């Protein structure tokens, strides 16, 4: 068949998660938006595989159930908004709560850094960036209005899942 890759974005309220995956599944710029999946067959490096997109939404809790199926993703986009502080600080959190459920430090991630076509930045490249490489993952600055760098993130990810399956 068709090679999956379940992908999970994740990250604080109003940081943009549904506009990136909307941006990357439906190809448009949704200004006002529910956690649902999104799913498209696309091309990352020659081989087509599809993708299955959990666009996370609703309230913070730690049941059973909710750890299953967070469980399920097999990579997570950790997005925070350039122009919000508080987002990128909680990035931590959202690292940890994966890394638990997951039950490993070697966890397919990319740090997004979204919202990059506005001016008002509140947190620079370089500390997103050399938090990341503490981490020992990528870090990719995105707008899902233009759709900049919007590709790259998503296919980062999954070409973290597949150098992670050897
Ligand atoms: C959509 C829900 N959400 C979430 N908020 C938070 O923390 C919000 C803050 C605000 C102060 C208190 N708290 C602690 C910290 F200070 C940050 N953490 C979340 C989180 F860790 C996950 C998560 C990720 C990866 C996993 F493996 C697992 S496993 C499991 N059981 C998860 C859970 N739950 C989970 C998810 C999930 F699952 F959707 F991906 C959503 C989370 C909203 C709540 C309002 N929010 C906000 O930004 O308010 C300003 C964001
Ligand atoms: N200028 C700009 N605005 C963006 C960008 N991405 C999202 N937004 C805007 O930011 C707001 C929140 O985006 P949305 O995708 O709803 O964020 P979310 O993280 O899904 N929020 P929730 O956690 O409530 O579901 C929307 O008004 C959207 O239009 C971006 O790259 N650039
Ligand atoms: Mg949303």
Redesign the pocket.
């Known amino acids: 068949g068709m090679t999956e890759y379940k992908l999970?974005v994740?990250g604080?309220?109003g940081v943009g998660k549904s506009a990136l995956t909307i941006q990357l599944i439906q190809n448009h710029f949704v200004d006002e938006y529910i956690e649902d999946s999104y799913r498209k067959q696309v091309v990352i490096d020659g081989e087509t595989c599809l993708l299955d997109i959990l666009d996370?939404?609703?309230?913070?809790?730690?049941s059973a159930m909710?750890?299953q199926y967070?469980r399920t993703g097999e990579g997570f986009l950790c997005v925070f908004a350039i122009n919000n502080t508080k987002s990128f600080e909680?990035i931590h959190?959202?690292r940890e709560?994966?890394k638990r459920?997951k039950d490993s430090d070697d966890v397919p991630m990319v740090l997004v850094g979204n919202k990059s076509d506005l001016a008002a930045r509140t947190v620079e490249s370089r500390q997103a960036q050399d938090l990341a490489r503490s981490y020992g993952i990528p870090y990719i600055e995105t707008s899902a209005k233009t759709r900049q760098g919007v590709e790259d993130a998503f296919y980062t990810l999954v070409r973290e899942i597949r150098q992670h399956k050897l």
């Open positions: 999970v994740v604080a309220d996370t939404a609703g309230q913070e809790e730690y909710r750890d967070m909680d959190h959202y709560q994966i459920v």
